[PDB]
Enzyme design. Sequence first.
Site, PDB file in Angstrom:
ATOM      1  CG  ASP A 161      -1.963   1.156   1.132  1.00 42.98           C
ATOM      2  OD1 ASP A 161      -2.492   1.463   0.035  1.00 42.98           O
ATOM      3  OD2 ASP A 161      -2.242   1.749   2.196  1.00 42.98           O
ATOM      4  NE  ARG A 165      -4.030   6.038   0.667  1.00 42.73           N
ATOM      5  CZ  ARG A 165      -3.883   4.724   0.623  1.00 42.73           C
ATOM      6  NH1 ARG A 165      -3.468   4.063   1.696  1.00 42.73           N
ATOM      7  NH2 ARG A 165      -4.163   4.074  -0.496  1.00 42.73           N
ATOM      8  CG  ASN A 166       0.326   4.319   3.929  1.00 42.50           C
ATOM      9  OD1 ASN A 166      -0.021   4.453   5.105  1.00 42.50           O
ATOM     10  ND2 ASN A 166      -0.366   3.588   3.056  1.00 42.50           N
ATOM     11  CG  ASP A 179       1.187  -0.014   6.165  1.00 43.67           C
ATOM     12  OD1 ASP A 179       1.366  -1.240   5.976  1.00 43.67           O
ATOM     13  OD2 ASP A 179       0.153   0.603   5.827  1.00 43.67           O
TER      14      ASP A 179
HETATM   15  C1  LIG Z   1       0.017  14.046  11.185  1.00 44.62           C
HETATM   16  O1  LIG Z   1       0.428  13.661  12.505  1.00 44.62           O
HETATM   17  C2  LIG Z   1       0.995  12.376  12.612  1.00 44.62           C
HETATM   18  C3  LIG Z   1       2.390  12.134  12.751  1.00 44.62           C
HETATM   19  C4  LIG Z   1       2.887  10.796  12.840  1.00 44.62           C
HETATM   20  N1  LIG Z   1       4.226  10.498  12.975  1.00 44.62           N
HETATM   21  C5  LIG Z   1       4.639   9.201  13.048  1.00 44.62           C
HETATM   22  C6  LIG Z   1       3.753   8.103  13.002  1.00 44.62           C
HETATM   23  C7  LIG Z   1       2.393   8.345  12.876  1.00 44.62           C
HETATM   24  O2  LIG Z   1       1.407   7.325  12.826  1.00 44.62           O
HETATM   25  C8  LIG Z   1       1.923   6.043  12.573  1.00 44.62           C
HETATM   26  C9  LIG Z   1       2.229   5.563  11.260  1.00 44.62           C
HETATM   27  C10 LIG Z   1       2.798   4.275  11.068  1.00 44.62           C
HETATM   28  C11 LIG Z   1       3.073   3.400  12.203  1.00 44.62           C
HETATM   29  C12 LIG Z   1       3.701   2.068  12.077  1.00 44.62           C
HETATM   30  C13 LIG Z   1       4.147   1.514  10.768  1.00 44.62           C
HETATM   31  O3  LIG Z   1       4.396   2.245   9.829  1.00 44.62           O
HETATM   32  N2  LIG Z   1       4.333   0.167  10.679  1.00 44.62           N
HETATM   33  C14 LIG Z   1       4.784  -0.513   9.555  1.00 44.62           C
HETATM   34  C15 LIG Z   1       6.011  -0.089   8.895  1.00 44.62           C
HETATM   35  C16 LIG Z   1       6.491  -0.764   7.744  1.00 44.62           C
HETATM   36  C17 LIG Z   1       5.745  -1.855   7.262  1.00 44.62           C
HETATM   37 CL1  LIG Z   1       6.301  -2.683   5.861  1.00 44.62          CL
HETATM   38  C18 LIG Z   1       4.536  -2.290   7.899  1.00 44.62           C
HETATM   39  C19 LIG Z   1       4.068  -1.611   9.044  1.00 44.62           C
HETATM   40  C20 LIG Z   1       3.916   1.301  13.273  1.00 44.62           C
HETATM   41  C21 LIG Z   1       3.549   1.802  14.552  1.00 44.62           C
HETATM   42  C22 LIG Z   1       2.968   3.093  14.685  1.00 44.62           C
HETATM   43  C23 LIG Z   1       2.733   3.895  13.537  1.00 44.62           C
HETATM   44  C24 LIG Z   1       2.165   5.200  13.703  1.00 44.62           C
HETATM   45  C25 LIG Z   1       1.971   9.700  12.808  1.00 44.62           C
HETATM   46  C26 LIG Z   1       0.614   9.968  12.678  1.00 44.62           C
HETATM   47  C27 LIG Z   1       0.123  11.270  12.598  1.00 44.62           C
HETATM   48  O4  LIG Z   1      -1.269  11.338  12.494  1.00 44.62           O
HETATM   49  C28 LIG Z   1      -1.842  11.428  11.216  1.00 44.62           C
END
Ligand SMILES: COc1cc2nccc(Oc3ccc4c(C(=O)Nc5ccc(Cl)cc5)cccc4c3)c2cc1OC
Length: 292
Positions: A161, A165-166, A179
Amino acid sequence: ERLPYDASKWEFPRDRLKLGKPLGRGAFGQVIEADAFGIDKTATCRTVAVKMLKEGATHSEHRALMSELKILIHIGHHLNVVNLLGACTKPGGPLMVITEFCKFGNLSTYLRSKRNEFVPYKVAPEDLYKDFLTLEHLICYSFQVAKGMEFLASRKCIHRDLAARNILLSEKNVVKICDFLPLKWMAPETIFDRVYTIQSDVWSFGVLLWEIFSLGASPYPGVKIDEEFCRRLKEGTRMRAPDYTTPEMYQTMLDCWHGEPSQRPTFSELVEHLGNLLQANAQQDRHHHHHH
Ligand SMILES: COc1cc2nccc(Oc3ccc4c(C(=O)Nc5ccc(Cl)cc5)cccc4c3)c2cc1OC
């Protein structure tokens, strides 16, 4: 799943986290902004993003979160993939996966907002474009996301995916692959066969490129996602070049959207290529700057 969990190295104390405002709530869990104390040797109170299950979760959704965690531990560290900082897994409270925080959020929305703050390149007085997006930024991001996708593939990892957005944006224009319809990013074989391969990700990187160079536009503008959409995609039809793309960039998008997955470039080739496009733009920018 078969992957292990080194709690000595990863486990973080729950009471060392002050859960803040929710950032986003999905169908299996939710991400929450938070303050962590002692999360890392350096700073004392770092802001982090925590992913935990939402109230009332299927014993399986638990294991799913745990697998995501082990996968992240397995994947390893890379500047261009959201960094795993810790995790609360032992009994006592809810399961939580902690990562670094990226204040600017998802890349799509970010780009969408810089549409009135963009210039192909800068010249003196460059304070006229302070905090402005330029081709170098747009190409830089693509370079970074490719280096991170090269990293992921080198570890038998398939995103499934990949999309703006990711992609999260942090300080100093450093993007990170993370993700959290998706048909607009899916490759033909993935749609008609349900086959997800590394090359199906390259197709998606193609859609991502278009997003980046349309400054956060929605792919396939106007098109309704229906039989015809899929039919045309299968048959060869492709998006037209986005308003901020360059000749070489758009072509890379076509290359990425090749019908034969085997004919699409590989992330290694893409890194190699974008780095070059990044270099040329730079030299070009230097002359532009030097004569004006
Ligand atoms: C805009 O403000 C934000 C800032 C942000 N900064 C960092 C992370 C945010 O949310 C996330 C996004 C991705 C993950 C993954 C994750 O990405 N896991 C993963 C990685 C690689 C693969 Cl292959 C599979 C799974 C694992 C654990 C927690 C996570 C939190 C944010 C969310 C926000 O809200 C919208």
